[PDB]
Amino acid sequence: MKNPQHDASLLSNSNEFRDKNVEFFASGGTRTSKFDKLENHPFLGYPYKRGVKRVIQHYEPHVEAGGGEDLYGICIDIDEFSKTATIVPITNNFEGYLVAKDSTVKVKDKLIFNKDGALEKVKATINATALTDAKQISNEVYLVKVAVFGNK
């Protein structure tokens, strides 16, 4: 979900400081500015670390995983109790680890959000650049460090 370390079978070792941050619980961004706009929205599904779209239906509009021409922003954190997602609008740039489609993503590749909100190699719609190779954490979960800096 968001925190898979609460079912740990043994204590972790905290002596090393290298290769210690590429995890699914690393919510937020690698570098964050105080003047980054953050918007909280209700969500349906599991949009964590994915591109999101607004869905309008009677209730207020909600956000869910999506992309393409419907891309509205990026979900970087979730409160599970309130079922609320923190979103960085697409008008604000972002640097951080995001969910990728497969493991074929390499450095310097241009990326696009797909219909599931996952980043895949490539016109394009947004400017997103991979800074690292895709890294496997679960059998079907790959994270890639990406700088998203607007639309093309």
């Binding site: 003047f35 980054d36 706009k37 309008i56 697409i90 008008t91 016109k123 639309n151 093309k152």
Partner: protein
């Protein structure tokens, strides 16, 4: 056709309900605002209140101004105005906005764009999506709640 026309009356108006009381032309700003929003001000030509604006240049004797316009010349959204100084408060197009804007004389979820007069109209190059239906204030005055969240590829 002003933001907050002032006129005295012999009687006080009565407020009955707290709902649908924000649907007035005097309500300036955005319905939901962030402390990190970038806000500019420019000399106003015409009356661009609650409209999309473009940068207009004169003969060079005076500084550049903003006037109600859209299309490919859109620069931002005029969210407030001071009539004493003739100053228009502009939110740049690089910053997302959510609020009531003037609509051309439309259902939630419809895609919108800015016409040559800066009015919203049903559909191009700008992320502008309506969150409600048109609300009639005057015979030729309609306002709609909308979200503007950047430009579009093609």
């Amino acid at each position: 056709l002003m933001k907050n026309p002032q006129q005295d009356s012999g009687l006080l108006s009565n407020s009955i309900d707290f709902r649908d009381q924000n649907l007035i032309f005097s309500n300036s700003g955005g319905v939901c605002t962030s402390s990190k929003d970038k806000i500019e001000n420019y000399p106003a030509k015409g009356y661009p209140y609650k409209r999309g604006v473009k940068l207009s240049f004169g003969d060079g004797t005076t500084e550049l101004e903003v006037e109600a316009g859209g299309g490919d010349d859109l620069y931002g959204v005029c969210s407030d105005i001071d009539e004493f100084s003739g100053m228009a408060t502009v939110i740049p197009i690089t910053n997302n906005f959510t609020g009531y804007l003037t609509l051309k004389k439309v259902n939630p979820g419809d895609k919108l764009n800015f016409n040559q007069h800066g009015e919203l109209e049903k559909v191009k190059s700008v992320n502008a999506i309506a969150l409600s239906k048109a609300h009639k204030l005057t015979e030729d005055l309609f306002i709609v709640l909308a979200s503007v969240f950047g430009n579009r590829a093609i």
